[PDB]
Design a protein around this nucleic acid. Structure first.
Lengths: 100, 150, 206
RNA sequence: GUACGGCCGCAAGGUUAAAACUCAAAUGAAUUGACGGGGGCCCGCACAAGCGGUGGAGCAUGUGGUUUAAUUCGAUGCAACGCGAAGAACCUUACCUGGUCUUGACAUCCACGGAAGUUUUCAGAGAUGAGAAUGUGCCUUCGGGAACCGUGAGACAGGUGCUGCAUGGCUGUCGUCAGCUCGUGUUGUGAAAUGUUGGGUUAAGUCCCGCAACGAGCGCAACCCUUAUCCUUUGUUGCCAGCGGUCCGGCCGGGAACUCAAAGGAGACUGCCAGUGAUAAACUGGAGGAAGGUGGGGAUGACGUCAAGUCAUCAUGGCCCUUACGACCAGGGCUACACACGUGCUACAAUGGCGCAUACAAAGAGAAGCGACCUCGCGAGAGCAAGCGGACCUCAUAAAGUGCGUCGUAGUCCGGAUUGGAGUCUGCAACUCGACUCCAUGAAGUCGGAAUCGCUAGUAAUCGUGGAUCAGAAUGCCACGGUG
RNA sequence: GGGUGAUUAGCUCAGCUGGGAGAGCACCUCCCUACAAGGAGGGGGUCGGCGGUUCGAUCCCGUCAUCACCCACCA
RNA sequence: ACUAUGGUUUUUAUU
């Protein structure tokens, strides 16, 4: 399990949607200039790029039922093992296993 | 252990209904492409008509008969160490081997235009020298020694 | 080989789902998360109510929730007000209004879910293991089954060794696509080992 | 059957024939396995006949072992090594180091101070540790609380740590192989045999015949799904033969003929006839038709499996740690090679390549998304913006192929890796170890050596299209189509 | 009476820079398997002793002991 | 053509 991997998820993909899923305009202002060979911004780039606990990077969704980083299916909310488990029990609509 | 499988006749040619030509393109087909064979078909016979080509009634069917395979073998066994035996091939196999013998003899060394490398081989297919004949006699000198104890 | 439930591998053979509904392409997985939450809640509240399955339909912009029980009198209470407090919470975790449909199971000793519970009862007081499955076979064939299979695994005796026992009666037939076979696997939670229990029951083709 | 003494022999020896010491089984008889360098006999892309390959070169890429501060943990008889654990700067991480806190990231009951929160400065790699402002919400049997953020107790919490020689479950595979159980009878001293053995014949205990063996189950076979041709029912955002009008566009009326998308009937049963052969059963051949001979094909998995794997999918007995085999951060290791083995893909060409035009889709995916049109520029990119909830737009001029110029055996001015220059972007950030573009750069390499693969048909051979995973980037993993 | 080699690990023995304790079989133990083979890391020394030289002596000189080996020892 | 040899130990079985 290692519950610290969910403690990352809570402050990444579950908190990024209102602040980091669109943010590239907030750095592009430092490339907004009136003329070439002229500066008005200097080192303020290191203040516009100051966050480290949150990023557009390092974002893993993980399986919402097993915390597993590989073998998740977004359309069902299940992993490779639970797709069979729900299908064999008939607990998932529209999906069948054989016989076409 | 019995193969003998199905039955497959294949299709004839679209321009004259030929059964031999529609099979010969399946020997010059490489990478699943028959177009490269259709650049060599008729052009080899028309390039033979720049050097020696007299009569065309059978096209190249008699060049494939002056080319004559005879030295085919099989292996016989009752355990470990095996015994070689020669085989009397059917006309359908004799023809299928003659079709490779001549196009492999035309490929023996690198040059331009396969229709022309094959026309040089078809002009030889009235006297048959070197390629498709000199290996045959050097293994035919065992053809009765490999019958002795059946 | 791979075992798996005879229900969902034969669901292409005129069989019904245990959950049947249609949802939006931006929340189908979240409605299936709800479909799990309603079962994981009800199997903790109705834990003594002899439940054989919970089936989900979603008509009328609500959730129906159909509960197959051999003890409905402790689900609905005395009468119909104890469930008004229950469906309030089912509707809370579903995000929609909730109906609740309560269905009585006539023959619980014919159902693989509750036959495994009836076997688990006698493993508490450790009766002879080879009798415990024969009573479950007898009781099910006397209830209109056309064949039954059983298996019990690990710490059945007697001594420290781990062994398995089975016995089989009548028809299965596991490759028969139309057989509509009833299946279950469970554990008896004993004070040494655990004892694993398996049951397969046949009644007739569809 | 060795010793000592006797007896017989010329003699090797023959004959009489011990004891001490020593172990838990030797042996006769019939029976079931299993193997043979025994016998008969079934069948296999094991052999047979054909072709395309692998074993060189350059890159990508999988494993073991030694090593190391990590080089995570597993899978070695034939059932391990493009594999479980899908896109390694930091991440994700098990592994490893230096920090920090130990009721702890995660869960609850009680006490104690605070609302939850919102802003801003300093110390520090950061975790966090110190300040300076701001807000004081909910319930008010009117008691003082709840709830929420933390902290200090008492019980506790943590563990993808180690064990399938502790297991419930999960699983490899003989094998689509035709075989296996439950009972009753009989024979045999009994274990054991029978039947399940035999005679034809099948993919098959097949389909019949037959013996002291005969029923009921699990397999085989069937169920359900899919298709060649005719007939019918029905048609938009699909179709377009006839007919009116025409952004001349199946575009709009309109038709229902024709693709197609689709439910329903017909058709195929070894049924007919010959040949073999228990005037048997069953095959081989012929006939019909669009076409048979499990129809061509799917889902297919009877028992029992190796002194076999998996506690890293989940539980769980035991061992052990918690001044940590935690967790919160900054960096490492997973891209050490001292040596041991493979799988790909591209060029090795000419029957070909290179450049520049041109024909055809099939199937997915697409409302903070697929992104047209037109551009700014050498170009990646950047700029503006329509249609589209997808039979009504977009991803998207499919590439092989068809063609015209051009290059040529020089071991390739081919193959363009590789080393530089100029860049464009993504992110806190591109030293090693990130994509993509323009202008330079210049290399190995004639299908191979012992040896050895896969397929009998839309198969082998060969060239393109799409999707999931998604900061930026797959030669990774699965479908779709042309040629055949 | 004179020369020459030895005395180092339980057993057999090597001896290159003089700052040196070691190889295999035995003893202990981990890995692979429970062993063994095979891998790897350890335990245990009178380097015969004493004196001298030396920054330090198993390691070079000298000399005492015991063992081997060629010579001399009545004529 | 013909084709050497295989170190130590190895189920509970109840009523």
């Amino acid at each position: 399990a290692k519950q610290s991997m969910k403690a990352r998820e809570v402050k990444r993909v579950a908190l990024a949607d209102k602040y980091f899923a669109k943010r590239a305009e907030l750095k592009a202002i430092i490339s907004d200039v009136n003329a070439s060979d002229e500066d008005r911004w200097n080192a303020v780039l290191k203040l516009q790029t100051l966050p480290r606990d949150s990023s557009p990077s390092r974002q893993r969704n993980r399986c919402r039922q097993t915390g597993r980083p590989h073998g998740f299916l977004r359309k069902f909310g299940l992993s490779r093992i639970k797709v069979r488990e729900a299908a064999m029990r008939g607990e998932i609509p529209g999906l069948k296993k054989a016989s076409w | 252990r019995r193969r003998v499988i199905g039955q497959r006749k294949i299709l004839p040619d679209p321009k004259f209904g030929s059964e031999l030509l529609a099979k010969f393109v399946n020997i010059l087909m490489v990478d699943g492409k028959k177009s490269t064979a259709e650049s060599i078909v008729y052009s080899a016979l028309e390039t033979l008509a720049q050097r020696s080509g007299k009569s065309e009634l059978e096209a190249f069917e008699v060049a494939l008969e002056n080319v004559r395979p005879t030295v085919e073998v099989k292996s016989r066994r009752v355990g470990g160490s095996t015994y070689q035996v020669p085989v009397e091939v059917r006309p359908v196999r004799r023809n299928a081997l003659a079709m490779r013998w001549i196009v492999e003899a035309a490929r023996k060394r690198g040059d331009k235009s396969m229709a022309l490398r094959l026309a040089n081989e078809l002009s030889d297919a009235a006297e048959n020298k070197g390629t498709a004949v000199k290996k045959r006699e050097d293994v035919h000198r065992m053809a009765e020694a490999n019958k002795a104890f059946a | 080989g791979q075992k798996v439930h005879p229900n969902g591998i034969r669901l292409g053979i005129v069989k019904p789902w245990n959950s049947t509904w249609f949802a939006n392409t931006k929340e189908f997985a979240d409605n299936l998360d709800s479909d799990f939450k309603v079962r994981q809640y009800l199997t903790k509240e109705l834990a003594k109510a002899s439940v054989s399955r919970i089936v989900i339909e979603r008509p009328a912009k609500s959730i129906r929730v159909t509960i197959h029980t051999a003890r409905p009198g402790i689900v609905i209470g005395k009468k119909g007000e104890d469930v008004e407090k229950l469906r309030k919470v089912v509707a809370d975790i579903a995000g929609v209004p909730a109906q609740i449909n309560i269905a009585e199971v006539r023959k619980p000793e014919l159902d693989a879910k509750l036959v495994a519970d009836s076997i688990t009862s006698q493993l508490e007081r450790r009766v002879m293991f080879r009798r415990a499955m024969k009573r479950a076979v007898q009781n099910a064939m006397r209830l209109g089954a056309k064949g039954i299979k059983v298996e019990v695994s690990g710490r059945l005796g007697g001594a420290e060794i781990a062994r398995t026992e089975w016995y089989r009666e009548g028809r299965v037939p596991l490759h028969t696509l139309r057989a509509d076979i009833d299946y279950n696997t469970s554990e008896a939670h004993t004070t040494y080992g655990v004892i694993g229990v398996k049951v397969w029951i046949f009644k007739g083709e569809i």
